[PDB]
């Protein structure tokens, strides 16, 4: 129930339907450990989306500004995109090579440790900036 609610809210906020279930479960567990009332904020956010009928996260962010639910939404987006929740240097990393902040350049820029296609791929010309690859 709570895990499905968190996954649905994450899919709405990040704007991408394909989200790893294990990464989402780990993120939810970490969020509940960090904040003991996280699920209440999740339900309040989803209630806001359902009541106001927000088409995408652009409208939800444009409205609802200055509400106390903005920080948790931004935290969810940052956790899904970067893979961490805390700003410290020992913060646990929950997603690398699958974090959503690497995907928009996955087709050109190499996710460092993991190799691109072959030992001389960079001889080829890169794709245009104005096209979004996938997801």
């Amino acid at each position: 129930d709570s895990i499905s609610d968190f996954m649905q809210l994450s899919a709405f906020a990040t704007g991408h339907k394909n989200l790893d279930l294990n990464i989402g479960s780990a993120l939810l567990l970490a969020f509940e450990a960090q904040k003991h009332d996280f699920s209440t904020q999740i339900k309040a956010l989803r209630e806001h989306i359902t009541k106001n009928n927000y088409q995408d996260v652009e409208a939800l962010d444009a409205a609802m500004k200055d509400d106390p639910l903005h920080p948790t939404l931004i935290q969810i987006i940052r956790a899904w995109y970067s893979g961490v929740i805390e700003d410290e240097t020992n913060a646990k990393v929950y997603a690398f090579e699958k974090a959503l902040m690497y995907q928009p350049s996955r087709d050109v820029v190499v996710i460092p440790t993991y190799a691109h296609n072959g030992p001389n791929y960079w001889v080829s010309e890169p794709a245009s900036v104005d096209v979004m690859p996938a997801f």
């Binding site: 990393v93 699958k98 190799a115 791929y121």
Partner: protein, 413 residues
């Protein structure tokens, strides 16, 4: 090139008579890991003092086919004279001319092979040849089949001697003609079944895939390593397209020898849509020298996932093979997978070389223990290869030691 040169290339005599990349060529000095010890290839360059320069046509034919030296001593079965016995007389003459005239002599003695008793003396090998039914008439064309089939059979049996390593041996280490091309263990590596069995062998392989694998050693579902690396990079890649087509045509007609407990082809194993957890690896930070990383998925991600992607599908351009749907990982016997992990892949085709880094104890990139290699192999087999196969640390240690010791070798103790 001359006919003798082409025959020498096809017979792969330069692969075993040349001590690796260095050591001139056809000069001998290459150590063959026989089950009972090391057998060193003799010098072949036409040196009248240290080579076979004084060999006559009849003496060379005897040495090549019947395995009898010029002095009369029996050559060790490391020579595939059981395969060359059926070579035509014209082919033997062309090879003799090529060796006499087309290779510069090298005056450098090769190490003498010293085997333990009773293999120390090379005189009991006459009884071994008698028991092995080695003798046979020179090859002639079978009129029931076309010329392509006959040439393919000639190349597979006589010249390229595929059955030397792809056919299992009996108790006396003689070829087991009953299980023709049914797959064999040749030490650290295992040659898979290459019969026309749709599931056990290569019957399901496409003709284009088989041709590409034989010519280059690289295909979407299989990559050549170990003895194939040497065989393709020394003999097969230089053969004309007609010869490879003939070999494929003959292989398509090989009778099938099914394996026990085989349901799908080695290259038809789908990959499990699973992987490791990044979150679980956080506790293993500040923990250099990974000894607490006992998880198979974590070990694979740390060691192997850089090149073969985390899902095991490899790189997009195919340079790094897809472990999903791969013959080596899809084999029921995980000997080839363990050997690939331990020693790596090194194949130089058309002057371009791929290279797996070795991951055994002598590794430079990342040495691995038997338990770690077993865990990685188990994860790869369960998620990307044959689920039924399993790897234990004892299997890895045995592959490191050189494979199962044959019962015949135990007699020299």
């Amino acid at each position: 090139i001359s006919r003798g040169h082409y025959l020498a290339i096809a017979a792969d005599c330069a692969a075993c008579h040349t001590n690796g990349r260095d050591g001139q060529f056809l000069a001998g000095g290459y150590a063959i890991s026989s089950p009972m010890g090391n057998i060193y290839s003799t010098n072949i360059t036409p040196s009248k003092t240290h080579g076979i320069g004084n060999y006559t046509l009849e003496q060379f034919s005897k040495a090549l086919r019947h395995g009898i030296r010029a002095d009369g001593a029996q050559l060790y079965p490391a020579m595939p004279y059981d395969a060359y016995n059926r070579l035509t007389d014209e082919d033997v003459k062309s090879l003799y001319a090529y060796i006499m005239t087309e290779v510069k002599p090298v005056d450098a003695p090769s190490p003498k092979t010293q085997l333990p008793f009773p293999f120390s003396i090379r005189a009991s090998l006459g009884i071994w040849k008698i028991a092995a039914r080695i003798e046979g008439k020179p090859y002639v064309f079978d009129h029931t089949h076309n010329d392509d089939w006959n040439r393919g059979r000639y190349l597979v049996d006589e010249l390229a001697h595929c059955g030397e390593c792809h056919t299992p041996r009996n108790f006396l280490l003689a070829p087991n003609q009953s299980a023709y091309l049914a797959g064999a263990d040749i030490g650290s590596w295992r040659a898979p079944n290459i019969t026309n069995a749709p599931q056990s062998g290569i019957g399901s392989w496409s003709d284009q895939d088989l041709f590409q694998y034989l010519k280059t050693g690289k295909t979407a579902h299989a990559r050549a390593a170990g003895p194939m690396a040497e065989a393709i990079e020394h003999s097969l890649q230089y053969l004309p397209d007609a010869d490879i087509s003939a070999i494929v045509t003959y292989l398509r007609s090989v009778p099938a020898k099914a394996e026990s407990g085989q349901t799908v082809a080695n290259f038809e194993h789908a990959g499990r849509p699973s992987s490791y957890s990044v979150a679980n690896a956080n506790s293993r930070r500040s923990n250099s020298t990974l000894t607490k990383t006992t998880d198979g998925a974590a070990l694979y991600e740390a060691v192997c996932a850089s090149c073969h992607q985390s899902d095991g599908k490899g790189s997009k351009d195919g340079y790094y093979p897809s472990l999903v749907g791969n013959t080596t990982t899809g084999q029921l016997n995980p000997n080839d997978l363990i050997a690939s992990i331990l020693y790596g892949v090194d194949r130089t085709t058309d002057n371009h070389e791929i290279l797996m880094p070795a991951f055994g104890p002598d590794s430079l990139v990342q040495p691995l223990t038997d338990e770690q290699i077993a865990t990685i192999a188990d994860y790869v087999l369960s998620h990307f290869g044959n689920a039924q196969a399993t790897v234990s640390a004892d299997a890895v240690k045995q592959v490191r030691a050189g494979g199962k010791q044959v019962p015949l070798a135990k007699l020299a103790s």
